[PDB]
Design a protein around this ligand. Structure first.
Ligand SMILES: Nc1ncnc2c1ncn2[C@@H]1O[C@H](COP(=O)(O)OP(=O)(O)OP(=O)(O)O)[C@@H](O)[C@H]1O
Ligand SMILES: Nc1ncnc2c1ncn2[C@@H]1O[C@H](COP(=O)(O)OP(=O)(O)OP(=O)(O)O)[C@@H](O)[C@H]1O
Ligand SMILES: Nc1ncnc2c1ncn2[C@@H]1O[C@H](COP(=O)(O)OP(=O)(O)O)[C@@H](O)[C@H]1O
Ligand SMILES: [Mg+2]
Ligand SMILES: [Mg+2]
Lengths: 340, 324, 315
């Protein structure tokens, strides 16, 4: 259906037609011996066929790194960033979340993950100059009900938080109508949702941000310590699908994760009391891994809770940390607190 | 006596030829194609292509190989102890594979090797190019810029300390824009795209003969998802390894591959082992593993045909891959 | 036989081949399978010329069986003994390695197969002063290791320089390349029957599994045929031309159902003559050059004997 335009000899295309090969993806799916036995023809013509199919699929532009560096507008994924709404957090993240790959947020309960997720959901609708993407967001609740009251309070207090942006266009922004909420209850339900509903929303352009309220919640209620292989298969499939969608539509994916204690009797966590859940198979699918921690009254006997946001690993970010507080306006980082 | 099975003949022409009763090319060499076509019921085109493919299908000893490998240098790593343990750096004409836990520094090492391959021969480099194939999207230009700036600062420092005119002559060409234009970028989001790019590599290397390094940052990700059939994966991996080693030996390159670690619950205490099964274990000439120990990164050589395995410490600074 | 050519056999003409290929009998196999009387009288051809042609055709195409004792005295001197540096196999091989047999080593990653091949090649080239051909298929050769091995036995530059030039190395990454290399070697040594020096006596293949592993898989049959043809030509080379051939291989499933076995399936098991299963020790004494060597198949001595081989301190 598509290999017809390729230059070739009639014998090989007749063999392809007799062998029921549809597109270049199908022929690249099979290997050397498989194609040789299917077409029943010599090796050099198979090599020529593979070369021609590869040249058809790709291999046109010689893209150097100067084209990546200088041409800012040609490759937004390498330069454009999604701001977190607070200058201190953006400085810690050197601009914000990347537009490609998966970003993980992990921590214990009552740490402030949902507040950051809501702030990122609101912050995506700003124009590109103000650190937004001029699009909506998708929220997938996997554990419990969505906090509508807190979202309404944040929307009401939004003019107070965005002090730098002048407020003439703030009233034009319709925050409520550009946020989509979904609910799931099983691992299979979440897989079906990400397979079917999410691409429809991203392709048509309603939203350019995907948030999962708790990826670890469905997986902790089905698989025990003796069923690691099916869980690994499901995690690999979900990660592959999410990465493919994010790369295709240039939409950041933010995943919220839970933690489990060390239970001291590796992966880089030597003296840490808690570690991200879902094992190492899930950790291989991510790009930037964060961690939000709260020191309890033992260290928080000073009057107010102590919250620190830490960077665990990233291809372009040193391991750092800062501090932040949660108020009626949102999440704000404490100035002059970044650690080196 | 040469059996026809040992030739790249099409199965149809081979089967009809052996049905006729010919079992040696020495007598196919002189048979006129007219009666050849008449006897076995074929046409002129297949006869001539069989004749040419049969007729178409050097003497280097150990001394020549030793001299040749002494002529070409090694790729610096900017880690002195790692260079010492590896015999002087990453060797050419061989496939090198690196494993390690996520967030350990494999991508940093790949970026440093991409930068380090452009060091002029006067300072002790190889002065070549680099090809970077990304399968995960973890290629950030800012980190490469920072690494190149650190490298050029160190190079200027050592050149000034040497106080030699020839060193200065090889620095004005060594500018940030020039070196950063010698890294060719690709991106394969699927294993089929990666395979197609691999098939297309030899022509690209023929066009650009100055390339001395090929990097494939991540081969486990394309093959570890959405592949239920293990035999197909094994065949694809074996073919890819054979093609990569063939490219390395044909074009005098240094293939760099990146792998992933997987937990194995042995006895009762789980330990990390490289992924992609056990058959893949000896598909790479050299195997390197990066540990974590206790807040200390260790680079332990695992398999090599030249040096015994040992252990070396290292760490990552805002300037790149460094020792100490 | 193909088409008629002058000089194949005395008394051939175009009328004979025309009538025979008209009678649906052209090749030698069916001509000899069919009764000589049938073609002689049914076609009306002369009996004497026909029987003379058949006898001269068989005689020049056959191998006449010979007596045993005479070939035994000639093989008493034709054979040779090659030592690598350890006598574990030497004692269990009738006190000497066989030149003209297909021996092989099966070992996993980091076992030391190519180390054994390298040390054996160095010992053969330097100590015994004969040419040796080495075939590499995965880039497992480095000349620095060869130089280091040679320096452990000699301290003179001239001997090291001379020894290296008698070790010939060729790169083959596909089965067709390997077949072409071996066929070229066969042709060259056939042309060099007159000469007495410069002929390689030891042929080493670094890895026969890696070349042929992509060809396996699926439900087809051409890969098995290719590997069988490679085995047959290797055996013919080693037997006819009196060469010592050494190849390597990998292991297969170690699970409960299947014990540690050589790769390439059951069909490859009948190919070699001697098997050496290198292995690594566990617990105390691990790492380094400590490797356990065992003899699985020899077909000449009792098997199942385990020994110790050190490589780190050896050469
Ligand atoms: N005005 C405020 N409105 C809401 N929360 C506030 C306010 N001031 C402080 N907070 C703090 O905000 C925190 C909200 O916790 P949050 O829901 O983010 O926790 P989480 O465990 O990360 O969430 P989830 O389990 O839903 O992922 C509370 O612990 C509370 O102390
Ligand atoms: N399938 C294989 N293909 C190639 N070489 C192999 C294979 N399996 C094992 N080896 C060889 O086994 C050897 C065992 O590792 P070891 O570290 O002992 O060797 P080495 O580097 O030669 O050691 P030393 O320099 O101390 O003598 C490796 O060097 C490797 O070349
Ligand atoms: N600009 C920088 N300054 C200092 N350290 C950095 C910088 N960028 C990255 N790093 C460190 O280098 C490491 C890179 O790991 P990475 O290459 O992402 O591993 P992997 O490739 O296995 O994901 C991170 O742990 C990070 O802490
Ligand atoms: Mg929360
Ligand atoms: Mg990486």
């Amino acid at each position: 259906m598509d290999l017809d335009l390729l230059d070739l000899n009639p014998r090989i295309i007749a063999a392809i037609k007799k062998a029921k090969l549809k597109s270049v993806k199908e022929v690249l799916h099979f290997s050397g011996p498989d194609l040789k036995r299917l077409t029943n023809l010599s090796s050099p013509e198979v090599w020529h066929l593979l070369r021609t199919a590869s040249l058809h699929l790709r291999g046109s532009s010689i893209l150097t790194a100067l084209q990546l560096h200088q041409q800012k507008e040609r490759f937004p994924t390498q330069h454009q960033r999604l701001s977190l709404g607070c200058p201190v957090l953006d400085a810690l993240l050197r601009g914000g979340l990347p537009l490609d790959g998966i970003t993980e947020l992990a921590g214990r309960s009552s740490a402030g993950k949902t507040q950051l997720a809501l702030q990122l959901c609101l912050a995506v609708q700003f124009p590109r100059q103000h650190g937004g993407l001029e699009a909506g967001a998708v929220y997938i609740c996997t554990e419990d009900a969505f906090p509508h009251k807190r979202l309404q309070q944040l929307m009401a207090q939004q003019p107070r938080l965005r002090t730098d942006v002048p407020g003439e266009l703030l009233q034009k922004l319709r925050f409520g109508s550009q946020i989509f909420i979904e609910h799931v209850a099983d691992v299979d339900t979440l897989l079906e949702c990400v397979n079917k509903k999410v691409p429809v929303l991203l392709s048509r352009g309603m939203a350019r941000l995907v948030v999962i309220d708790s990826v670890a919640a469905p997986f902790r209620c089905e698989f025990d310590s003796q069923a690691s292989a099916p869980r690994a298969r499901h995690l690999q499939s979900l990660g592959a699908t999410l990465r493919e969608l994010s790369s295709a539509f240039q939409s950041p994916v933010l995943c919220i994760n839970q933690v489990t204690e060390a239970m001291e009797e590796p992966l880089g966590f030597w003296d840490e009391r808690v570690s991200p859940a879902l094992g190492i198979t899930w950790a291989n699918q991510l790009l930037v891994r964060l961690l939000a921690d709260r020191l309890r009254e033992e260290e928080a006997a000073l009057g107010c809770p102590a919250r620190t946001l830490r960077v665990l690993s990233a291809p372009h970010l040193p391991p750092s940390s800062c501090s932040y507080t949660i108020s009626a306006e949102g999440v704000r980082g404490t100035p002059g607190t970044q650690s080196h | 006596q040469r059996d026809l099975v040992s030739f790249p003949l099409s199965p149809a022409v081979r089967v009809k030829l052996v049905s006729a009763g010919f079992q040696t090319a020495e007598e196919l060499l002189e048979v006129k194609p007219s009666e050849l076509s008449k006897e076995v019921g074929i046409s002129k085109a297949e006869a001539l292509e069989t004749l040419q493919i049969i007729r178409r299908e050097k003497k280097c000893t150990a001394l020549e190989l030793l001299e040749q490998e002494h002529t070409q240098g090694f790729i610096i790593t900017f880690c002195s102890a790692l260079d010492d343990i590896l015999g002087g750096g990453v060797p050419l004409m061989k496939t090198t594979e690196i494993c390690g836990a996520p967030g350990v520094g494999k991508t940093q090492l790949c970026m440093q090797l991409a930068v380090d391959v452009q060091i002029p021969e006067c300072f002790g480099g190889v002065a070549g190019e680099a090809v970077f194939i990304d399968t995960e999207g973890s290629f950030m230009v800012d980190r490469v810029v920072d690494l190149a700036t650190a490298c050029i600062q160190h190079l200027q420092l050592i050149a000034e300390k040497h106080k030699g005119e020839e060193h200065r002559k090889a620095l004005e060409d060594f500018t940030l824009d020039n070196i950063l234009s010698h890294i060719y970028y690709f991106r394969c989001r699927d294993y089929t795209e990666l395979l197609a790019q691999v098939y297309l590599l030899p022509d690209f290397l023929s066009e650009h003969s100055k390339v001395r390094l090929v990097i494939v940052d991540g081969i486990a990700f394309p093959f570890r998802h959405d592949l239920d059939d293990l035999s197909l994966r094994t065949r694809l991996l074996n073919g890819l390894a054979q093609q990569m080693i063939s490219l390395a030996n044909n074009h005098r390159l240094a293939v760099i591959l990146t792998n992933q670690m997987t937990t194995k619950i042995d006895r009762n205490q789980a330990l990390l082992v490289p992924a992609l099964g056990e058959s893949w274990g000896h598909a790479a000439t050299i195997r390197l593993i990066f540990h974590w120990d206790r807040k200390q990164r260790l680079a332990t050589l695992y398999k090599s045909p030249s040096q015994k395995e040992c252990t070396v410490l290292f760490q990552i600074k805002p300037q790149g891959f460094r020792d100490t | 036989m193909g088409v008629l050519r002058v000089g194949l056999c005395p008394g051939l003409t175009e009328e004979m081949i025309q009538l025979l290929r008209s009678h649906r009998i052209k090749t030698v196999v069916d001509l000899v399978s069919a009764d000589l009387e049938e073609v002689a009288q049914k076609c009306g051809l002369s009996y004497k010329a026909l029987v003379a042609l058949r006898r001269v055709l068989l005689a020049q195409f056959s191998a006449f069986p010979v007596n045993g004792a005479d070939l035994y005295e000639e093989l008493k001197t034709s054979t040779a003994i090659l030592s690598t540096g350890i006598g574990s196999l030497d004692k269990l091989l009738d006190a000497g390695l066989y030149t003209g047999e297909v021996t092989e080593i099966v070992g996993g990653p980091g076992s030391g197969k190519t180390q054994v091949c390298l040390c054996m090649a160095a010992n053969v080239a330097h100590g015994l002063q004969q040419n040796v051909l080495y075939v590499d298929s995965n880039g497992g050769l480095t000349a620095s290791r060869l130089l280091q091995l040679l320096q452990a036995k000699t301290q003179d530059e001239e001997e090291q320089a001379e020894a290296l030039r008698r070790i010939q190395v060729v790169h083959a990454f596909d089965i067709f390349q390997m077949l072409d290399v071996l066929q070229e070697l066969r042709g060259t040594v056939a042309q060099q029957v007159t000469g007495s020096s410069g002929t390689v006596k030891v042929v080493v293949v670094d890895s026969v599994t890696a070349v042929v592993s992509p060809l396996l898989g699926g439900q087809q049959r051409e890969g098995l045929a290719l590997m069988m043809q490679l085995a047959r030509e290797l055996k013919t080379l080693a037997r006819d031309l009196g060469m010592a051939v050494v190849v390597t291989n990998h292991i297969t499933r170690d699970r409960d159902s299947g014990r540690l076995k050589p790769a390439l399936g059951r069909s490859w098991s009948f190919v070699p003559s001697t098997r050496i299963l290198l292995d690594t020790i566990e617990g105390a004494g691990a790492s380094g050059g400590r490797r356990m060597a065992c003899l699985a198949k020899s077909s000449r001595q009792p098997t199942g004997f385990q020994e110790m081989v050190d490589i780190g301190t050896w050469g």
